[PDB]
Design a protein around this ligand. Sequence first.
Ligand SMILES: *[C@@H]1O[C@H](CO)[C@@H](O)[C@H](O)[C@H]1NC(C)=O
Ligand SMILES: *[C@@H]1O[C@H](CO)[C@@H](O)[C@H](O)[C@H]1NC(C)=O
Ligand SMILES: *[C@@H]1O[C@H](CO)[C@@H](O)[C@H](O)[C@H]1NC(C)=O
Lengths: 495, 495, 495, 75, 75, 75
Amino acid sequence: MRCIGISNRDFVEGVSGGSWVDIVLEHGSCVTTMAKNKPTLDFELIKTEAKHPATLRKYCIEAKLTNTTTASRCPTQGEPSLNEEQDKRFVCKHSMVDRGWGNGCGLFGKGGIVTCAMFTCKKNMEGKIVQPENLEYTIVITPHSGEENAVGQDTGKHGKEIKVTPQSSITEAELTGYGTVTMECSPRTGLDFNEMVLLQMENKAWLVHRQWFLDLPLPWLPGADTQGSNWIQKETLVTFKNPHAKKQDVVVLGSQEGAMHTALTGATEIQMSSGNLLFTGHLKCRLRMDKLQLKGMSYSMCTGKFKVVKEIAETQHGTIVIRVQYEGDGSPCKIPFEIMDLEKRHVLGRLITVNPIVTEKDSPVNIEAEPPFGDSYIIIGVEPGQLKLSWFKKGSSIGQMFETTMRGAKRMAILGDTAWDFGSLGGVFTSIGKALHQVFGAIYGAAFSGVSWTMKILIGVVITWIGMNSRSTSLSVSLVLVGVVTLYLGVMVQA
Amino acid sequence: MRCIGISNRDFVEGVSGGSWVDIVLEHGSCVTTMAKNKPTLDFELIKTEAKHPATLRKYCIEAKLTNTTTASRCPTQGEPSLNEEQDKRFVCKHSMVDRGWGNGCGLFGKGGIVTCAMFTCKKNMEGKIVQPENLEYTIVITPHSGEENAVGQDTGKHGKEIKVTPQSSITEAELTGYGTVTMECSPRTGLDFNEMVLLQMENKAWLVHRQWFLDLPLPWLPGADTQGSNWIQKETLVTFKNPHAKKQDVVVLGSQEGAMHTALTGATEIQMSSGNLLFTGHLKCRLRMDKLQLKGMSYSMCTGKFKVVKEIAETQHGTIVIRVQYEGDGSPCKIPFEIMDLEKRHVLGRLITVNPIVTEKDSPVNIEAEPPFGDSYIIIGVEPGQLKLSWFKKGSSIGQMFETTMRGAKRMAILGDTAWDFGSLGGVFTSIGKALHQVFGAIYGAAFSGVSWTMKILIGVVITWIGMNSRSTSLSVSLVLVGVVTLYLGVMVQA
Amino acid sequence: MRCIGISNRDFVEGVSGGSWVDIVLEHGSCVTTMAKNKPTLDFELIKTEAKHPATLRKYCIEAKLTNTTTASRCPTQGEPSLNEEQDKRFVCKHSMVDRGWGNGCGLFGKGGIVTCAMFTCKKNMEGKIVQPENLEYTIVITPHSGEENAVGQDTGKHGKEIKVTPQSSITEAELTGYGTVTMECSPRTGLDFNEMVLLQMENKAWLVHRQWFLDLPLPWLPGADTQGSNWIQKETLVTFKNPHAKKQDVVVLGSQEGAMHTALTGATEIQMSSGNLLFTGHLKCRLRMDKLQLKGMSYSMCTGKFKVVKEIAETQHGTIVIRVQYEGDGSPCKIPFEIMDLEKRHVLGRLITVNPIVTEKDSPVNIEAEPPFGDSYIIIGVEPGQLKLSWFKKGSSIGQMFETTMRGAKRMAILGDTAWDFGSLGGVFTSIGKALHQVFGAIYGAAFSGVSWTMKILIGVVITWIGMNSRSTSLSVSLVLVGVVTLYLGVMVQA
Amino acid sequence: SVALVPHVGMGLETRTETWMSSEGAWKHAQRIETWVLRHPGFTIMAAILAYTIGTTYFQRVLIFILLTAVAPSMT
Amino acid sequence: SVALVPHVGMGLETRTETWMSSEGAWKHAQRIETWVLRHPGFTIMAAILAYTIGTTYFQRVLIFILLTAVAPSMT
Amino acid sequence: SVALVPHVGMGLETRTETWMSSEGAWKHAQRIETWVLRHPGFTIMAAILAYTIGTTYFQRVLIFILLTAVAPSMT
Ligand SMILES: *[C@@H]1O[C@H](CO)[C@@H](O)[C@H](O)[C@H]1NC(C)=O
Ligand SMILES: *[C@@H]1O[C@H](CO)[C@@H](O)[C@H](O)[C@H]1NC(C)=O
Ligand SMILES: *[C@@H]1O[C@H](CO)[C@@H](O)[C@H](O)[C@H]1NC(C)=O
């Protein structure tokens, strides 16, 4: 029940002929899966670890200068020479300075001048890479079970956490009383590692684009370097001054920690202090329901009286959760639960905590259900003393449809074609849509790479105007669709 | 003899009816003035102090957070509040976090969350301001005496140093043997302080625009605060991260010294360690030559031999210098210096060190002269032992005219509408041009302020093309001229 | 008489009002000057010296690679690192090799590889520059004097040597018995040593263009190095090999001595081992004959027999030289010499050794004369024993005019506009011709710089064709003239 | 500087909030607004140039927006 | 941040070398060149949009240049 | 190599013979002739191309000569 209380919750209903459903698990989100006569598990992706990283490159964000020396050459006589120019750890620069009888030359022209200074780094911005093989994922599966303190407990109690790695395609969890749950997760198709860099800087880390990190305009070492002294591109972190063509000097150009923090705008943050922990991204899994059981299956109905120990509370997703305690005999029995209309003729509600059971007499099982829109009615227990509770739900079916469409669109914006197999059950139309989305997304991503959201909005407005002012209806409609999609992506991007 | 060896030397010839000439002295430049009956003088603006600076802001470039406190209320329950929200030395922000039974609230919504942390500065910038009446300009006047060590000398006692302030703007300098020179300057119309800030970093200083300093996006203190603890834009130096909707916290953004160095591009660097010293800018002065006489005009021609002790050398202006020594009698005597053709029938060049004289026999004297572009001969002395020195000049009058025109254009580009005072002697054309330049420069600056050189080049190209294809011939010519001027300015800007 | 038998001999006849004649002295050429009532003199520029050279650049023409190391990195993770890459004394390159489980890396692909080697110079050529004021020209002036061994005497025993330097514009040579000869040379406008480099490789030297020297693609050091180890572009003298995308290697290219000999094809050799004295170029001189009385005019005449001891010999320029022996009395007397017709009625010769005298009566005297085309007779001595020696010129006045025109054209080709100063008095026609030649040569040298003679001939043919097949008669004439001049220059160049 | 090249449009974003998303969302717009406020003269010139160059009102508005956005940017 | 307002068109420039003048002279051009190299997809789309929106060739070129220069800039 | 880019058109020639003037006067033409002898195929193709890009016998001859002279000398 760990999903009860999460705003990014998703409900996955139904399995395929093989009794499997493929789901996508995002960090900060969890998926509630239910199927006819199945234990209704909650899935959340809680950890992503990277092991055995290789330092791709090192950068200098803070350097100092020492041993500043200079040499000069009389005009027309070539350039000056310093011995420091042989050592690559000295930053040298050639300029020209006025020369004449006053300053010691026999000629009156621009003479050569060279300034050098030892370049020593003070602070680093090491960046690492990992192969997908060392890409362990931690997932926690929680059966609902209506346990007393399991309604929103994220500590992991009552749930089993499985580790998903590329080594094993199959992950097995034995849920006590519920059977076994099999996960076929694709850790290699989630975050596209080996084109991303794990960037560490002063006890902070970020997950960054590999090319963008290799293009950073800072002094850097190969990453296989050991001496740490042959910094290349040191000129990006130094300044040479020749104000009036009389003298040349060198300064070290100050720390770049704030500049790098500004440059890391749009990149997600990660923990590299201990173990390279990531808490962003998704994971596509195929969930097998074959060996899942209902814990209360083969129990009798509870014929005793029930009491409400925690009043009905409505969740962010149109469901309600109530806690009831059983005061009757036959303690291991299954709770009679129904959501009916005000006339008590139809069963209007849908139960998420399917097959609620009283495991122990004095144990407050809490149940979740999805009431209909309006004046649904909740019945707990059997006729002699059954609880007789009324509920109203605010929204409407049309509003729910609009919210669902927006949620699907946002999933298609966060994820690419990977959004197409979020709750897929085989399906040929799903495959066709995924392929079409793959092609269209490749084109769109190639056309919109490296662009901010304001630029995307500008381009969307331009394209929509072009479509609106198009003489051909087909081209006009296509351009309007492209512009609307671009406007939506610009509005939703950079989150 | 001090302007020799400086690439930015200017020549001012002639005075007005009043025996004065307007000149503009720049820090990195030297001015030599010549009049019909006056000694040649060299002028250099060497120093520009700013006294009694006052701070107006103390921007923070590196801070830290210590005391992080948090408060969340409940969904539907309004916003939480912390005691630190009223403490101006704490940085605060409100967010929303998922709430429910698992969190201990009991309503399943987004509950307000506010986190604060104490803000402490570690490094800051002091934007000092100096009122315009505390500026002091130091101008060195050195006459073309001909001393052996006077050529290119930058620290000799041959010249005289005059201090110029907005109060004592008119000063007089006694030049031993050359009368007195009166300088009537206008320091109030130079750098135009009261619109500028003296920005001081850890060990470096800049002269920056006051509005640009006031608009900087860092946290600042009023400048009179002894205790600090009331920084204004603390939010610009911290980041509040709320990944997903579970928790909120705040971290500092890292040292901004490098970012401020990057932002300080385009501002001339200054010195502020041992006083506020500005080796940049210009000063307009009116030079009174009336009490200025040539030394030794009542002397006889030497009538003896000379020996060249320093070979004739050409400066990067078209003038030549030479050091000769006298072995003859009547040592305090005029030196017979001429630049003629091979047959000694025409005077081809002129003397820049006018009235060369020998004061002490065993004291070499170095003369400067401007020879013609072709081949010329320097004749020093008279028939017995007279030395004739061949010299060739590699330029031409057309090239010299082009260089003079380009130098004037560059002076206009730097000293906008003040270049019309550089060597003026009054006049109606000069005044009309100065007024027209003032009007056009005001209009141009209104339309090009804040624009980079690349943008100026783009705008100039656009304006030039518009003028090129324009119906009106007068409008076409005017627009093409404006675009050409803009293109030249963009080519010459940011030096 | 030093000038007889050179094949590059110019006869300068006459002087201007002032008794000065312009001449240009070439190292391979020689000038004989004749004027009314003045001795015939021979001028030969025999030596040009450059003193106090400054080394501009040193190039490496042979090198050896040692200390070859290599490092490789695994594919898709960074670049390899070598400590030796820290030192600029090593030549380093980065390449890509194939990597896989066979090479010891975890993954397959292109891995980075770096090869290093120490670059040591074995043989280098040094480029030295000289200031024009440091040049010294050695001119030998030899009066004819008809001495026994003065004909073609390269020893200079009879002639006087004068050193021409930029320090003194007037050079005086006292010829015993002939007065004093004054020369005002211009050793500044001849060879332009400010644009030239004195290059030596090993026991050889050349005078090369400074820009061509600076553009040579060889590893080089500044003239001020003092270590000879930090060579700038060592990649030009080495080659890295990666034949099959594995095992990158580096080798040294080999001695560039022969390649540099080929590169120096169009340069002129010089001497650099014994004081870098170069026997090439020309020196423009103004010769003054004011104080050059004829020798031995007080002697009366020779009354005695003359015996021919060396028969008349034709010279390459149409002058005959005869050596005679005086057998009579009155030893210091004038030799009665004349070239007359058969009847001895008309004087038709022109004595070049003016006033031939006999000094010792045992030393033979050498007499040079210019006979006319056709038949002529040399008359020696008084009637008793008078010699009547017939001679036949075997030429023509028209052919002589054609030869003179060709010689002048070839001097224009070699000397440029300086040819107008050869044997030139002060004339308006010469001045206008020299100015026009200067303008046309300024255009032509700009248009035809850096091209070979074959290219010049092709361009001349093209221009001649364009001019001749042109409708305009003025354009046709101008283009045909330009093409013919270009063709002549291409035919007459590369010597 | 590095700050001139942020990590905004790299296509690696997830449902997790990025480093300085809230801060860096409207900072460019705020900077352009402040620049236009501080330099009205260039805004008038850009408007006039857009009107002259552009033939249609759409072209004129687009050019004006592009010029106004690029002016502070290229600095 | 502060680096995005780099005291460029403030006037006040004299005949003395300014702070980081040589670097800042061409840093923006280098950045645009690198961005165009790394994002060829946007450049083609900008070229197509400039061709479509602008009628005359001068308008098309101006629009394409402005779009290319403002694309990385909006950051 | 330095063997290329010789010291030919430097304008410093005097009446004195240069380093390898007599030897190097005709070497370029000699090696062009040897190349044309060894590669008749390219000469025929160059002639055909020159005729195709013609409109005048002068143009044909000039183009053919330039092509035949530049082929042995590139890379
Ligand atoms: C730099 O200077 C220090 C003295 O402060 C000296 O000990 C050191 O050897 C020098 N290093 C180099 C590379 O010159
Ligand atoms: C901040 O925390 C420190 C403990 O490290 C405490 O001593 C101090 O009083 C606190 N200051 C506040 C909360 O203002
Ligand atoms: C180069 O190799 C030689 C021989 O192995 C060795 O003595 C020398 O120290 C080496 N030098 C360097 C710089 O590695």
